[PDB]
Structures are given as C-alpha cells and as structure tokens.
Write a protein that binds this ligand. Structure first.
Ligand SMILES: Nc1ncnc2c1ncn2[C@@H]1O[C@H](COP(=O)(O)OP(=O)(O)NP(=O)(O)O)[C@@H](O)[C@H]1O
Ligand SMILES: Nc1ncnc2c1ncn2[C@@H]1O[C@H](COP(=O)(O)OP(=O)(O)NP(=O)(O)O)[C@@H](O)[C@H]1O
Ligand SMILES: Nc1ncnc2c1ncn2[C@@H]1O[C@H](COP(=O)(O)OP(=O)(O)NP(=O)(O)O)[C@@H](O)[C@H]1O
Ligand SMILES: [Mg+2]
Ligand SMILES: [Mg+2]
Ligand SMILES: [Mg+2]
Lengths: 26, 54, 467, 487, 466, 128, 161, 128
C-alpha cells in the first residue's frame, strides 16, 4: 500500500513528478 | 497536497507569464527588424534594376 | 515590307525597317530559318526600329538578317478541326499528324467582350470533391482559379476536374499547357486517347490541345495562353455551345513577361515584375469569360512563387475569379489531400439565396469550427489540452475529424495515395459534415475520417480499425 | 573585312566587347587571338558582348576575334565512361585524351510531347525511404534539396553505386550509365568523390563532368548543359542514363554573375529575370522516349541548397516547380539520427507507384500518407493525455516505420531486400518491439533472409511481386524470427 | 612603356597608355611617390585606357601623373628568408630589419592546382579541444574554417590552435593578417619573439608573417591574402614541406572586394555585394590546398556580418572547407567557451571508417541528445524544465551536462576564464562523453562539468561542492 | 455637382489600391523615380487631392455634402504597407476587416477595437 | 482621437500666454482640411483666437494634405519663422506646435523621391537626419528668449525603432 | 598630435552611429550601391581606419598614446545589428549599458557579464 497523491491539473511545476496499484489524481 | 499544488502553480504561472512577456518583446523586435529589412531589400532590388538601364 | 535584324539579346530582337514600319502586335517572319521563326512587335523604339519578342529560340540569328512583316498579328487555325489536335503558340501542329486542315484562322490578340455582353447567370457546377462543393463551389460558366505553391496539388486537382466534369461534357473543351511540364502534356494526350475524348481515326474528338511548355523561350510562354483562349473564343462565339477551358499554368504568362521586361527597357516594379503586370493580365483575363453569345467555364491553375499569396502575380489574379481554390503546403505536408485551405477558399455562389440555407449553414459551421481550432492550436500546444473545458476539447476533436473528412482519394491520384478514387455527391457531402458537426460521430476515432469518400466509409473504417 | 572577324574594344570580368564580327550568329562560339574561346551572347548594333571561357588576362584591347561558325559542342559516347572531364569535355584526370567518336551540341531544346511516353520503369536508388515513399522512374526528374551538410550528395552517390548490380549484367535494357556534374565545388571535394566511386567500382559506368569554383563563370554556367548532352547520347540511342547536377544553386550564381556583367538588369534577389528558364530548359531534357525514338531515357537528380531550411524560398520553389518531385532533407532530422534525413510530408514523387515494382507497391502502397499523418498526430499527442486505441496504434506504427526507413551509406539495397524489410513493418510485426531495437531487428532479419532464403528473395526479384506463396513464406519467417527476437 | 593617370576615385585609378597596353593583373608603378604605390590592372576600358586597383592610398594623385608598367603582376620574395620576417601586400619588409634577400620572387597571382594534383588522404589532426576533436575533427592537410560574429571567439580559437598545433609541427607556418587589428599583429609578432618561434638572431624562425590590416585601403585588403598564400605555396611546392597556414580574417578579402566593386561601377548583386563574389572567392580559395606535392593545413577565421550565416560571404565560404567550427553568440552569452555550435559544425572525416565506430557513435550520440534538447526549447522557454515528462527531463539534464563538458579552459583565455588552460587527449574526450551519455554521472551537478579538461576534473569538482 | 447644389452625395472608390497600381505603371514607364514598393513620390498627393474633395459645406455655400468611402486592399493584413498607410492617414477614420473574424462567424468582419471614426458621436442621432 | 488633444493644446496656448506673456504658433503639417476648419472654430470659441480685437494668442500655419510634397515639407519652417520673430525680436518664450512631425518627415521623403534621390533604409530619404536636424535645432533657448515645441508624433507600424 | 609628441590623449567619438548615418546620406546621394540597412559597403572601413589610429607607441616613437572611446547607439538592446557588430569587430572590448538596469536605478547601468576589456587587464594597477 502506497499509494500516491496529487491532482488532475498540470502547470504546477514538479508537483506530480515529485510524488510519482490505485493512486489519487488523474 | 493541494496547498502545495496551488502555490506551485502560482509560482509556475507567474514565471510563465514573465517568460511570455520577455518573449513578446524579443519577437516584436524580431518582427520589426524583419519588417524594415523586407522594405529595404525590395527597394534596393528596384533601384538596382532601374540604374542598370540605358 | 522588309526589315533587318539590328540587335539580338536573348528573346528580344530589334529590327530596322527602311520603309513601312510594322504596327505593335504584328507578326514578323525571320528569313533563312529551318523552321518558322516569328517575332511579335512590342515597341517602336524610334529611328525606324522596332523591338520584338521571339516565339522560338534566337540562336543562329545574325545582325542584318532579313525579316518580313506578315501584315497582321499571329494568326492561328480555329474551328472543328482543332479538336483532337495539338498546336503550338503560332498554330503549327505538334502532334505529327500533318496540317490542321482548317480554312478559318484568327489573330491571337483581340478586344475583350464589352460590359453589355456580360451574363449574370450563376448555377452550381458539382465536382464531387467534398471540400470544393461544400465550402467554395464552382459555377457553370464562371471563372475558377486554383492557387498553389510548387508541388502542392494544382495539376492533380485540374486533372481530377477534367476526369469528373470534362469526360462527360456534352460540348467542347480546350486545354492550354502554358509553361508547364512537357511530360504532363504527354501524359494528358495519351490519357485522352484512352478515354476516347480524343479520337485519332474519326471526327468525335471533344478537346483541342495547345502547348508551349517550360522548354520554350519566354516569348512562346507569354503568348501561348492567348493562342489557347483564341481557340476557345471561336467555340464560344461561332459554335455557341458550352466550352470548358483549362489552363495550366496561367502564372507562366506573367512570368514570361517578367523574363523579358528589363530587356524591353523597363524600370522594375516591386518583386522584379513588369510595371504593366496588371493591365497585361487584365487584357488577357477579360477575354476569358462567358458572354451572352456563349458559356466558358474556365479553370486556371495559378502558381504562387515562394508560397507567398501576396506575390504580385497571384495577388493580382484573385479579382479575376468567381471561385478560388487555394491550396497550401502546410496542409499537404500533413497528408491532407486535396490540400485545400478551408479558410482561404471562396465562391461568389456561397450565398444562402443560391445554394440554399442548409448548404450555407453547414459550410459556415465548418469554417467556424476550423477557424476556432486554428486559433486554439498554438495555445494548447503549450498549456496542454487538459486546460480546455469539455466544450472546447469537444470542438477540437470535432474539428480534427472535419479536417480529415475534407481529405479525399482522387481517381487521378491513385498512384500517390494507394486508395481507390472517390466521387461524392453534393447531398452526401452536406449530410456528412452536418452529422459530424452535430456530434453524431463523437465516439468514432479521428482516423476513420481520413482519406475516405462518403460518411458511410468513415463508419465502415471505424469498425475496420477496431479489428 | 569585319564580317568574319572583329577586334576587342574592352575586356573586364569575363566580358569582351567586340567591334565588327558583322556575320556572327547569336550564341556562336568565337576564338580570340590568344586561343581562348567565348560565346557571343549580346549582338548589339555597335558591338558583340562575348562571355569568355577562361582567364581574361589572356585577352587585350585590340586583339582579333574570329568566327567559328558554330555553336558549342562536346565529346559524347561510351569513351567518356570512367573519365573526369571539364565543362567542355576535356580530360582532367590525367589518363589521356578522350577517345570519343561523336560530338553533340550543348544547347538543344528538350523533346516535345510526341517523342515521349509516360515514366514506367523503376530507377532504383537502393535507398529504402526514396524507393518506397518518393519513387523515381526512368526519365524522371527528382530534386535533392536541403541545407548544407544534410546528406544531399550522399543520396546521389549511393544511387550511382546501386547501378553496379545491373551494369555487371548482359541485359542492356536494365543498365544505367551515370553522369555526375560538379558545379562550383572545390577540386579536392570532387577528387574525394571520384575516389569513392572508384573504390566502389562505379567509375567504370560513370562520367564525371567538373566545373569547379575557380573555373570561369561561363564554364560553370555551361557544365550542366554539357553533361546533359552526354546523357542525351544514351537517351537517343535506346540506352538509359542518370545525371546528377551538384549543384544548381551554384550554377544560378554563375549565371547571375555573367548576366549582371553583360549589363542585363537584375530581377528578384539580383538573379536574372529568366533564372527559372535557366533551370527549366535544362531539366526538361531529362525525358523518357517512346519506342519509335528508341525507348531510351535520361533521369535527372538536380541538387539545390536551401538556407536555414527554407524550402519555400524563390530559387528552391522555382526548381520544385520544374522537377517531378523532390527529396527534402532537414538538419533537425539529420541530428536526431533520422538518416537519410528525409522529411516525408514535404517530399513528393510526381510519378508515384507507376515507378515501382509490384512487390514494392504492395508493401509501400499507403505508407507515405500514413507517415505524414503520423507526424501530425505525434505533434498533437506530445503531452501525456488521453489518446484512444486507434491513435496510439498509429503512433506506435509510425515510430517503428520511421526507424525502419533509416539507412547507412554506401550499401544501397536490392529491391527484393527492401521489400522484405518493409513487409515486417507494414504487416505489424514490429509493433510490440521497443523503438530502439528496430535497427538491430532489420540488420539481423536482412542478413538472415540473405543467408538462408535466397530462393524467396530471388523469386520476389524475378516475379517482381509478392505471390501468395511468397506471402506465406515471409509470414512463417517473420513470426518465428520475431518470437526469437522478443524473448 | 609609360602611361598617364586620367581618373581617380578612391582605390580605382584609370590610366591611359600611348604605346603598348599592359595585360590584366600587371603591376604598375606610380611615379613620384615617397613610398611605392602599385596599381594592379583589372580591366581594359577601351581607347588605350586601363582600369586599375591601388595597393595603397591614392591621396595626392593628379591627372596626368606618370605610371610605369613593371611587365609582371605583383611579385614578392619567397623562400627561407621570409621566415621570421613581416611583409606587406607588395612584399616589402615592414619589420625595420632591412631587405628580404631571397634568391627567388613569385607573382601573387598563380593558377589553382589542377584536379590531377589533388590528394585524397584523410588523417585526423588532434587539437586537444574537446568539441572539435569529438564532433567535427580537423584533418592534416585539410581546410579548416572558424565562423563567428563580432567578438564571439574566432581569434582566441586560432591563437589556441597556433599554441596546440604549431609546436607539435615540424615544418613551416605562415600567418596572414587580412583586414584585422594591427595591434593583434603587434601582439603575435612580439609573442613569437618571446617564445622563440621567431628568432631575430639566427636562421631558426619557422613562421612567416604577412599583414594588411583594417587601417589599409581596400585594394590592399583584397590582395594581401594572395600575398600570404603565395608564401605558403613556395614552401608547399619548392620545399614540399608540411605547411600550416593561418588567416585572420578571410571575410575581409570579400568585403574589400565589395568596396572596390562599388567603385568599379559594376551592377551590384544581393546585399550590395560584387557580382563576382563567388568566382573571386573560388580563384583565391582553390589555391589554399594540399596537393600531392606538399601539405597545407589551413585554418581561416571567417567573420559573420550581423551574426547572419546566410550573408553571401560566409554562406559561400562553407563549400571551400573540409572542417567547420561554427561559433554562436547565444552560446557565448551562456558562458560556454569555446562558443562552438555542436549542431552546426561538421567535418568530412566524421566517418566510422576513418575515426572508428566508437568515436563516431559517441559523436552522433552527443548530437542526438543535444538536438532532442533543442527540439524542446519552445516549451522550456515559456514553462521551464519542470513541466516536462520523466523521459524528457532525463535528456534535458544529460544534454545540459554534455553542453557544459564541451566547454574548455584555453591557455590563451586564462585572464577571461580564471582557469588554467587544458588540453584533452582524444581517447579521454571520447571516454568522458561516452560515460555521461550512459548515465554514469546523472547524480553529479551540472556545474561540475563546466570549464574542466578531462572527466576526472568534473568528478573532483563535484566532490568539492557537495 | 450634388455637393455644390445643396444636396448630398455618397461616393465609393472600389478600390484605390487598383488606382495606385495604374498610376505606378504610368509613373515607372515615364521613368519617374521609384520609391518604396516602386511607387512614385507623389502617390500620397494622388489620393489626398481626391479625398479632400469630399466635404461638408456650410449653409452660406448651400449646405451640401460629399461623403467618401474609399476602399483599400491589404496584403496578408499589412495595414502599414505604403498605400494603406497613405489612405489611413488621409481619412477621418477606418473600418478594419479581418479574415479570422470572417471565418469565426463575425460578419461583417469588423475589428471594433481597431476601427475608428474621429467624427464620432457628432454623426449619431440621439436614439443611437 | 477622443483623448482631448485639441483642448490640451488650446489650454497650453492659454496658460503660457497668461503666465509667461508668450504667444503660440500652430503648424499643421499635413493638415486635414476638415480638422483645420474644426480647430480654427474651436479656438475662436475657447477665445484663444479673437476675430474682433488684437488679443489672439496663436498664429495658424496650415499645410493641408492635398498640397504637393514641397508645400507640406516646408510649412513647418514657415511656422518656425513666425515663432522666431516673437523670440528674436520681442524676447518671448514662444510655444510652437507641430502637428504632426511624422508628416513632416513623410513630405521630406516624397520630395527626396521626386528629386530622384536614392531612398535609404525603409524607404526614407537619405537626408532623414539632416532634414530633421536643420528644423529641430531652430527650436531652442537663446540669449533673447526661447521657442519650446509640442510635437504630435505618429509612430509607423507601432515600431518605436 | 599628442600621441606622436610622446604625450597621451583620449578621444571620445560621440557618436559613431550618427557619423555612419551622415556617411550613408553622402553615399546614397553619390548613388553608390546600398547593402545592409542601406549602408555602403565601405561603412566598416569608415570606422576601422578611424579607430586603428588610437594606438600605443613604443619608446623609439616617443612612447605616447591615443585612447579612443567610440559611442554606438543601439535600438532596443540589439547588439547584433550591422553597425554595432562592425564596431565591436574593431574595438578591444565594449562597455554595455542596459535600459532595464538604467530604469531600475542601477547607475552606471553597466551589464558586467556582457562587458569586456580585451587588453585592459595588463593596464590595471596591482591594488585594484
Ligand atoms: N490529390 C492528391 N492526392 C494525393 N497526392 C497528391 C494530390 N495532389 C498532389 N499530390 C502529390 O503532390 C505532387 C504534386 O502535385 P501537383 O498537382 O503536380 O503539384 P502542383 O501544385 O501542380 N506544382 P507545380 O506544377 O510544380 O507548380 C503529386 O505528384 C502527388 O505526389
Ligand atoms: N545515410 C547516412 N548515414 C550516415 N551518414 C550520412 C548519411 N548520409 C550522409 N551522411 C553524412 O553526412 C555528411 C553530409 O553528407 P553530404 O552528402 O556531404 O551532404 P551535402 O548536403 O551534399 N553536404 P555539402 O554539399 O557539403 O553542403 C557526410 O559526412 C556524410 O557521410
Ligand atoms: N575560449 C574563450 N574563453 C574565454 N573567453 C573567450 C574565449 N573566446 C572568446 N572569449 C571572449 O571574447 C573576447 C573576444 O574574443 P576574440 O577571439 O578576439 O573574438 P573574435 O570573434 O575574434 N572578435 P572580432 O575579431 O572583433 O570579430 C575575448 O577577449 C574574451 O573575452
Ligand atoms: Mg502543376
Ligand atoms: Mg554536397
Ligand atoms: Mg578576431
């Protein structure tokens, strides 16, 4: 169990890449 | 996660807006130098053709 | 009356006359030549000297060589016996089938029909080409121009038009090859013999051919358009019947003029052109017209130097047209053929009162969605598709399907596409775009719409692309 | 008597103004006192303007000028094969005088409509991307165009080297005699080129015509036409020739110099008003002849150098508007490893599948439109969003075909070998492979079919098509080979 | 015999002769000058009048002034005794050391070596400069050109090559100053006296200098390259020897020609240039060459007007070169020195069969990552590196390390870098870029790769920081 | 004639770009000096003489008027080309039309932001 | 347009006369006749021109658009000369309005073209700087007084360069 | 005069941009063929022969000197234009003054990063 949190929306620098079998946020 | 996301988007979109602004200046100055050069070069071609006569 | 050559520079030949000076436009015959060499009088220089343009190569000419005034401008064979034949700029047969057995001739220079002679009738000419019929339809007896840079599809389109409109035409056709590829003239000639449009053994031929290609010096290229249209003018006025006139490529008339302009002693205008570009064009174009006596549906391929539609040659050509089909390298480069710019092609008859409100509404709807997408493209290339509302991204997906449904495999383009040619009825064209706009195929993949005929083939393609 | 002779009035910058010569013909070759020759291009009321085929230090005011009574001509025939000549056909390779027995005028109008027939016989380059996407037929003109150092000459060289396969045979119908015209290049470059052709054993069927950077402008102007005439010898005698004009950008610059110095007023970009016609009259002479005229052909590959990748410029579009297609090379593709660096969407063949064997037409049929759409969709995709199954498939296929159409230099491929590799891609056998392993696949696949399936390759070649039997045999080979390559 | 001046406009002097007319290219001597004034015959105008180009100032010339035909083109001293000496365009000593007493003279106009004289030998000349050695290596006896806008680093680069190459060389060197800074000539001269490559006491000098700088009128700037070449031709042919020829700056030749063409009244070509730009360049360039008789390794600096590589002068120069080093102002401004554009610099010997597959693959590998990086530049400009995907961020980060590892401290630029100069052996250049491409240094910071020699210095640098 | 007889006339010049081309032909062929875009130095004077003759007369002169609507054709939207620049400066205001507006569905394709009338409200009824 | 230019001009005329006892000169270089008429009547209504007595504060000099290049090129100098009288003879601090300075430059360019002079960069007269300088340098403070100048500037293609 | 009298002079050319414009005026009126920005082909040489005359003389010539500070006006910070690059390609470095810094009240508005003195380091006191 991890399982990784961010969001749906881009244009926020490294928010998604910094955190990155479910995962919240598209 | 969201408080970090909203502030990181703030930072990113501010910086993007600044970059866009700086690129607009660069492109506007490229536009104008090119605008002037096209007029100048066309005129020199005309002058050259005219002077070569009779 | 007799003159003597006094100067030769390229295609420009100066001739001095001791007695009667030949009027401007007169054809002069050079003596002591293996084949007929015509000079056309362009200017009176003074001192009993005229400046001329040669209709063939000037190699071998000597200062002092005799020149005879023919007493008239270039006169060429006209009438029924031109049908099935190939003629050059000066009306000589170039198909090796012997003399043009006509007893009627016409000067290639003539006055344009007057204002009182104009016809205002305009009815649609369906081509079976989706993009043309939908957005910028051709008119029977109207003036059609096909604009394009080098290699974008002007000739392929005109050959398809010949295939869809001319092959089943009940009247006469004239094709004028002006400053183009000799290979294309040979291709066309043998294609028409195969199709039976030209018949070598009987009198059923429906097409007259006139050629002066890019192997010719500028004088020939400058006048061959007039030769071809003089043939067409006969069929319009003397036979009366409906004439189709294809010209590939009318730019070559203006270019030939620019090749000799400096040697005719003119200060250049902008972009190296002759100061007389517009009046020269006007005197030629105003003859290419339907009148009260007869109809000419004219289709002219119009070359666009350096892909710049603001180039004085094509720029000046627009005003002479009723329908414009503008092709684009940026579209061709994507594999979208025919490479018609849906946002730069127009027609006089694109009017709700003429084509009906349903045709008009769908065409304007298509242009709106395409212009809306074009204005978004660059923004979403940076900010991402994800930033768009479901409303905007719906019109992106739809616009990309409409772009693709505008493409079409041509019968004449099978050797390029790998696909069988398709002709699409106007009703089906309208229906298909209407349905895509209404969101009736939002569930289908983009590619199902690419390189098909009717909308049913897109549906069929969608199933095939699945498994 | 000033009918058959004249006197130099002035001389400067390769232009002699000559008094007299009353009987001289337009374009006639004349001879100066010193032995230099020149072409009478301007017949004016009081003088003849003569362009000098050499160094003007050898001409002075007052020198006699004498009529030749003749237009320029060149040595012509098979004795030129394996020789390097200048623009006038003089030997420059040090191997002795050229033992030709025929002469041909340099300035002859191209064949008209009747003597021709449609381009129908393949002119194989041995380059997968060209042969499949923008195929060349015998009698065709196909431009090679792009910035400096994009691989333009290399296309022409590999094409020449490819013909060895046919030229070693006894079937003269399939042979192709080659002509390489160097215009404005440096001599050491031309020498490196000749060495390459000699080491490939391709010189024996090639004529090299060279008018280099220190040759007088009229000579550089003339060289393409001279080479053309040498090629027309083959064309008009039931044989097939290929001519490369490397390059026509430098020829136009030479012509611009002469024309300006003859005081003909310039047009656009300072080029003469008829710079179109310069190139058009030359390239029209590349043709396919009908049977009545011997069935021979001359195929041309002119070369144009763009500046900063602008194919839309004036001279570039001029020549695109003459030829039957173009191969456009881009520096960006070159450096990304796409070599040959062909931009698919911007390149065309105006002869198409008619110039292909049935086998090639079978595998490449729709591939060019497919690859142009691939690149459009690849650009639209870029960012990691929601792509459906059908666009992902199209991207997957396009990536793998792009890799397949990469090729090294100096190993032009037999058509049946090209067909076998394209088959693997077009039928979807490479779809689940990593893009970076595609080149490795092809190298191993090709060498395997060569080593172990000569019968299959021979049959595809002989038949010129993929029979239902060949299709099944290929299928067995690829499916098993792929299963081995995958795991 | 003798002629009389009939017209003067700047460098262009018309001269009428009453008995016998001098041929084109003949050197004429103006009578009554304090210093020798040579006019070179360019055209025969008619009516016993020649148009000439002056090799020095024409102030003080009067119509009717006497001019003598020397009976030959400009002839200069050639041979051993030119070594360690400085001459001007007409072969006069300008070093205050007296006569150059050669046993031979040579006219500065000579025909280019013919096709049959060409050598096809291709052999690497290692410079110790990473960008060049890796991506676009020089060839022994090859033609090298260094392109750059104003102040980007053409002269620093030629000086570093004189340092790196012209000592591991056991033959002769010729430096031609063409339309550049006189004080740069003074700098070079006195530096060579200090180092000993010019010896003022013995016959051991190994370099000949020829100068016609930007203080000179255009006829001198137009011909001084030919003067330098002629000195090189002697050593190539009559000694057969390995010769290095350095020219700063060959653009000035074409520019000078534009100045005279304006005065010769020709119809101008594009951008106001002489219509003869390409043939003039060809006739001169084709003489700058190795032959079967002897080797010339030529390095020419090529000024780029208004940073525009499409300008007819630099544009026409490309085809005359075997190796190009193309410098960039944008790259200079990022602090990358030498400011070489790794994607616009080429060499004929960049061929697996010449440099080996390892060298070749590493080079292509480097140019691929750099182009991939370049292709992302539009989006990075607006949105930055953070908006890119995992895969793209890796290529960007590796490409930025490669960009930095392509920079190098030059011995000649120590004042401006603050770093001791470095020379990197070829195998080490290959190894270092090989390792970076493989991801062996993904953990090291970018700045560690900046202004170092071998890869070990980048590692040691990274260890110091954190 | 209408203007001077206490009446009101509207004239449309469709188009002045074509008239300037005709004048340029004559000027070049008379070997008058070419300027920008090969137009003669008096090309502005050509249009200013014409456009100044449109006027509103006071009551003392009968109170008639001549309103002019010159037409100018631009190339690829360049409102700063020579002849456009001339007629823009001469006139009291401009109605700018745009292709992207046209195809977006804005018909008449008037760019309201850029279009101007220096006469303004003075030409408007109370209702408007 | 619509930004109160003419009112600001008239108030400047009014204020300078009221506070410094200095008169103004208005030079309409390439004046639209309709706007020349409007300006005149607005000046009469504001009172800066009086038709009934000697209290007017501005001299008007009009070079209208329909006049030849020579007239439009020289009319600024005419305005300048009227202004120079009030400075050099009556010791005033004078205001000179030039509306507008671009049409001064434009008329100079037309004149240069007509005289067959080869055009410079962007089609302007080769004498662009000297045409400007000989006019501008007359506007200055001297020992007797000064001419100060407000110059309406049009910027071609919105290109400040 | 000072340079060759064993003395030291400083000369400021304020500015060479205007000089080149005056020379272009002369050259176009002489009908010499224009090039880049309509400047004559000898516009480089105009400035090169001038600035070559600033020099440092050896002791045998008296040991005097002339230092030159030519001034060039750029348009919108564009150093890559014809005349600016010409002069950079003559002088021994440049002091670049930046509009953005000047506006921020950074005065003197010198861009340290883009400014260079190619030969001045050998003429800087040990203390500095
Ligand atoms: N409708 C089409 N479908 C598929 N391919 C096409 C189509 N039209 C053009 N092409 C491709 O593009 C090439 C050029 O088309 P073509 O109609 O010959 O160009 P063009 O506009 O007449 N050029 P030019 O005569 O050089 O001014 C063709 O030979 C095809 O390879
Ligand atoms: N398919 C290929 N694979 C690998 N290298 C290639 C290929 N094609 C060309 N090259 C290399 O690319 C370089 C440029 O090729 P070349 O054929 O000289 O192009 P070009 O455009 O004619 N150059 P130039 O005429 O000198 O401006 C040469 O070093 C070739 O060896
Ligand atoms: N390799 C380098 N390392 C550090 N600084 C350099 C380097 N190359 C150039 N520079 C800087 O740029 C300045 C000018 O270099 P230089 O090589 O003289 O340029 P250039 O292209 O010859 N200029 P110009 O002759 O005036 O067109 C030097 O004084 C240094 O400040
Ligand atoms: Mg065509
Ligand atoms: Mg090449
Ligand atoms: Mg330098």
């Amino acid at each position: 169990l991890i399982i990784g949190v961010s969001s749906d929306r881009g244009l926020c620098g490294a928010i998604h890449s910094s955190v990155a079998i479910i995962g919240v946020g598209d | 996660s969201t408080t970090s996301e909203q502030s990181a988007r703030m930072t990113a979109m501010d910086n993007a807006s600044k970059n866009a602004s700086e690129m607009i200046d660069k492109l506007t100055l490229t536009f104008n130098r090119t605008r002037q050069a096209v007029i100048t070069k066309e005129l020199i071609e005309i002058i050259s053709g005219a002077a070569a006569l009779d | 009356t007799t003159g003597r050559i006094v100067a030769v520079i390229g295609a420009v030949v100066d001739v001095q006359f001791d007695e009667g000076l030949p009027p401007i436009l007169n054809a002069l015959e050079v003596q002591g030549r293996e084949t007929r060499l015509v000079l056309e009088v362009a200017q009176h220089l003074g001192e009993s000297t005229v400046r001329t343009i040669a209709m063939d190569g000037t190699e071998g000419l000597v200062r002092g060589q005799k020149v005879l005034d023919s007493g008239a401008p270039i006169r060429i064979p006209v009438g029924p016996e031109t049908l099935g034949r190939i003629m050059n700029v000066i009306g000589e047969p170039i198909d090796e089938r012997g003399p043009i057995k006509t007893k009627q001739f016409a000067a290639i220079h003539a006055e344009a029909p007057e204002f009182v002679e104009m016809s205002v009738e305009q009815e649609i000419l369906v081509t079976g080409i989706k993009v043309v019929d939908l957005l910028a339809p051709y008119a029977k007896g109207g003036k059609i121009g096909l604009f394009g840079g080098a290699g974008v599809g002007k000739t392929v389109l005109i050959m398809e038009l010949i295939n869809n409109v001319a092959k089943a035409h009940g009247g006469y056709s004239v094709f004028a090859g002006v400053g183009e590829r000799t290979r294309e003239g040979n291709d066309l000639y043998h294609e028409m013999i195969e199709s039976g449009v030209i018949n070598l053994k009987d009198a059923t031929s429906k097409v007259a051919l006139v050629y002066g290609q890019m192997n010719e010096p500028p004088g020939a290229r400058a006048r061959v358009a007039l030769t071809g249209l003089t043939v067409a003018e006969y069929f319009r006025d003397q036979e009366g019947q409906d004439v189709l006139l294809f010209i590939d490529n009318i730019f070559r008339f203006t270019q030939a003029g620019s090749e000799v302009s400096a040697l005719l002693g003119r200060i250049p205008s902008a972009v190296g052109y002759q100061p007389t570009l517009a009046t020269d064009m006007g005197t030629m174009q105003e003859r290419i017209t339907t009148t009260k006596k007869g109809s000419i549906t004219s289709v002219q391929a119009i070359y666009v130097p350096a892909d710049d539609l603001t180039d004085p040659a094509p720029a000046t050509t627009f005003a002479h047209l009723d329908a414009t089909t503008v092709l684009s390298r940026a579209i061709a480069e994507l594999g979208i053929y025919p490479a018609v710019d849906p946002l730069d092609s127009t027609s006089r008859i694109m009017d709700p009162n003429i084509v009906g409100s349903e045709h008009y509404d769908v065409a304007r709807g298509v242009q709106k969605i395409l212009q809306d997408y074009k204005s978004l493209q660059d923004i979403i290339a940076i900010l991402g598709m994800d930033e768009l509302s479901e409303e905007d991204k719906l019109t992106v997906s739809r616009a990309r399907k409409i772009q693709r449904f505008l493409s079409q495999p041509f019968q004449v383009a099978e050797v390029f596409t790998g696909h069988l040619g398709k002709l699409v009825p106007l009703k089906e064209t309208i229906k298909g775009f209407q349905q895509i706009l209404a969101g009736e195929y939002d569930h289908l993949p983009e590619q199902a719409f690419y390189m098909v005929g009717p909308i049913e083939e897109a549906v069929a393609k969608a199933d095939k692309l699945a498994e | 008597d000033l009918e058959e002779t004249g006197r130099v009035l002035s001389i400067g910058d390769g232009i002699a103004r000559v008094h007299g010569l009353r009987n001289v013909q337009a374009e006639e070759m004349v001879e100066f006192s010193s032995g230099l020759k020149g072409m009478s291009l301007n017949l004016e009321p009081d003088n003849v303007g003569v362009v000098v085929f050499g160094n003007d230090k050898l001409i002075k005011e007052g020198d006699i000028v004498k009529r030749t009574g003749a237009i320029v001509d060149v040595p012509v025939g098979e004795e030129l094969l394996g020789r390097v000549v200048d623009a006038l056909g003089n030997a420059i390779d040090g191997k002795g005088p050229i033992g030709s027995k025929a002469r041909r005028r340099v300035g002859l109008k191209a064949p008209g409509i009747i003597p021709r027939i449609s381009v129908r016989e393949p002119m194989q380059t041995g380059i997968k991307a060209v042969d499949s996407l923008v195929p060349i037929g015998r009698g065709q003109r196909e431009l090679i165009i792009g910035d400096r150092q994009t691989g333009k000459t290399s296309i022409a060289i590999d094409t020449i080297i490819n013909q060895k396969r046919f030229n070693d045979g006894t079937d003269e119908k399939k042979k192709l005699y080659c002509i390489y015209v160097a215009i404005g290049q440096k001599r050491s470059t031309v020498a490196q080129l000749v060495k390459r052709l000699t080491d490939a054993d391709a010189m024996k069927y090639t004529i090299v015509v060279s008018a280099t950077a220190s040759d007088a402008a009229p000579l550089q102007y003339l060289a393409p036409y001279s080479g053309c005439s040498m090629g027309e010898y083959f064309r008009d005698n039931g044989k097939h020739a290929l001519i490369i004009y490397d390059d026509l950008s430098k020829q136009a610059v030479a012509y611009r110099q002469m024309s300006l110095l003859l005081r003909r007023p310039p047009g656009r970009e300072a080029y003469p008003g008829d710079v179109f016609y310069l190139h058009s009259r030359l390239l029209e002479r590349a043709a396919k002849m009908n049977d009545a005229f011997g069935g021979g052909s001359l195929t041309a590959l002119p070369v144009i150098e763009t500046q900063a990748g602008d194919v839309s410029a004036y001279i570039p579009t001029n020549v695109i508007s003459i030829t039957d297609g173009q191969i456009f090379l881009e520096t960006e593709l070159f450096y990304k490893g796409i070599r040959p660096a062909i931009n698919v969407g911007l390149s065309v063949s105006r002869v198409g599948s008619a110039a292909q064997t049935r086998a090639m037409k079978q595998v490449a049929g729709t591939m060019k439109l497919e690859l142009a759409q691939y690149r459009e969709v690849a650009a639209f995709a870029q960012f990691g969003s929601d792509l459906d199954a059908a666009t992902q498939q199209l991207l997957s296929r396009g990536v793998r075909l792009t890799e397949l159409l990469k090729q090294g230099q100096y190993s032009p491929m037999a058509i049946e070998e090209q067909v076998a590799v394209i088959y693997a891609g077009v039928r979807g056998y490479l779809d689940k492979l990593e893009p970076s392993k595609i080149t490795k696949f092809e190298n191993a696949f090709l060498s395997h079919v060569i080593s172990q399936h000569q019968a299959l390759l021979g049959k595809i070649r002989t038949d010129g098509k993929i029979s239902e039997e060949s299709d099944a045999k290929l299928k067995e080979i690829v499916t098993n080979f792929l299963a081995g390559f995958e795991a």
